[PDB]
Symmetry: C2
Subunit: 104 residues, 2 copies
Amino acid sequence: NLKIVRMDRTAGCVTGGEEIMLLCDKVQKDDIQIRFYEEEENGGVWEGFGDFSPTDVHRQFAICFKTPKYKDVNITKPASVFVQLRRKSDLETSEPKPFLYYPE
Amino acid sequence: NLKIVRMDRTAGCVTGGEEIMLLCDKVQKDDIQIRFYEEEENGGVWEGFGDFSPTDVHRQFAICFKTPKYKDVNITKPASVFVQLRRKSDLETSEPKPFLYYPE
């Protein structure tokens, strides 16, 4: 039942720390994370997490957060990743949205 | 009971048409407008309205909209206005938030 309905930004700088506003279907403020991930060719999986507190969850239907730092702040072209909602308790996830990290 | 909790942008170009995401306390999608206004020195009051449809209201707790065109697209410095929620039915309003229009 997790869904990213809309994000006001779907790209960001590799240094992270940028404010994004996200509209979601209902979530519980203490049982929700925003996971950015990238599947590596070596079977590895990079992940980073949106930076926010339960108070940043707006009436269970939106979240304000800051982006995580991407794995490599020295990329020279954009890196495409995904972002999903994930419940902390049972690790249920939303369908992913594409997200582009760009060089500083 | 109307409240603008957060806006992801509190400035915009005088030409209008720019996407803003707004978090609000509960509203009814068919009984809500976003009014930008400016009190003139001559007792006049400019107003413009955010451009959106009821489907742009997200589960009664957020609204995505486009800014209205400011009264004067030829200003040479920023113009400070206010923005409020207003109920269409009984014209109840939220407390206003400052908003800055800037030259193209």
